[PDB]
């Protein structure tokens, strides 16, 4: 078996994967320090969920890189086969190599469900490094959810303004007969860190950034960064039910 993983609670995996579920297919990376699931869309967007090996009660890989593509929606349906309102549900994940299916052993109350998901052969790499990040903002996630689940979707773009000057941090939408602005002062108690060196105004397709709301709702803190190119990086610090910290990343190209 190339990959062997086990959880006392499936929700430490399924919950995080739901935050990137906006394509029915997902590439899975499994290395020595955890599992990385990746979904992409129209070559501008990439969402990565990182569940480190420390989360699992048991985790073993030997080939230092085992990669496969699966149906993320089928995977999620299987992982939540015992109900989305549970009384835990254990998991044993098993994948042993190319051409062979992803095995899922879910148990609850002695009831055992066995899933066999077939795998295909698998990606974008946005060279987003910290050495060329221009603007960075860290925000308290909770005080921000209300708003971005409420951002105008009739607009085609989401315009993000970051600046050392007023209005400091601004999300703007442009629907029909409606210009809408969302402003956050660097003074705010929601601002945990404000490091904007240069005034930058970028535009991103709203349909591409909308699923990030799922990650935001789960997160307690969110990191927002832009670089010279204008590429966006959204990092969501997520605390699972075991108090452990996992991470979801969103990259997006400009318009």
């Amino acid at each position: 078996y190339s990959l062997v993983a086990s959880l006392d609670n499936v929700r430490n995996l399924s919950t995080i994967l739901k935050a990137i579920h906006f394509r029915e297919h997902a590439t899975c990376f499994a290395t020595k320090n955890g599992i990385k699931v990746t979904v992409e869309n129209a070559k501008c967007v990439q969402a990565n969920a990182f569940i480190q090996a420390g989360i699992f009660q048991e985790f073993k890989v030997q080939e230092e890189s085992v990669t496969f593509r699966i149906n993320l929606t089928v995977l999620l349906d299987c992982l939540s086969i015992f109900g989305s309102s549970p009384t835990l549900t254990a998991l044993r994940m098993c994948y042993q190599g190319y051409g062979y299916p992803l095995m899922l052993f879910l148990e609850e109350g002695g009831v055992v469900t066995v899933c066999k998901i077939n795998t295909q052969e698998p990606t974008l790499d946005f060279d987003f490094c910290s050495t060329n990040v221009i603007n960075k903002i860290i925000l308290q996630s909770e005080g921000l959810r209300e708003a971005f689940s409420e951002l105008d979707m009739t607009s085609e773009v989401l315009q993000i303004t970051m600046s050392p000057d007023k209005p400091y941090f601004r999300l703007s939408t442009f629907g029909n007969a409606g210009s809408s602005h969302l402003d956050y002062p660097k003074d705010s108690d929601l601002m945990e860190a404000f490091h904007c060196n240069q005034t930058q105004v970028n535009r991103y397709k709203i349909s591409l950034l909308k699923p990030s709301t799922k990650a935001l709702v789960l997160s307690c803190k969110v990191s927002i960064r832009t670089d010279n190119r204008g590429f966006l990086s959204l990092q969501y610090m997520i605390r699972n039910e075991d108090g452990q910290i996992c991470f979801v990343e969103y990259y997006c190209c400009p318009d």
Binding site: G34, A193, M237
Partner: peptide, 10 residues
């Protein structure tokens, strides 16, 4: 590659 979390402050 794994994630490089940029959440360090204070």
């Amino acid at each position: 590659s794994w994630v490089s979390p940029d959440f360090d402050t204070a």
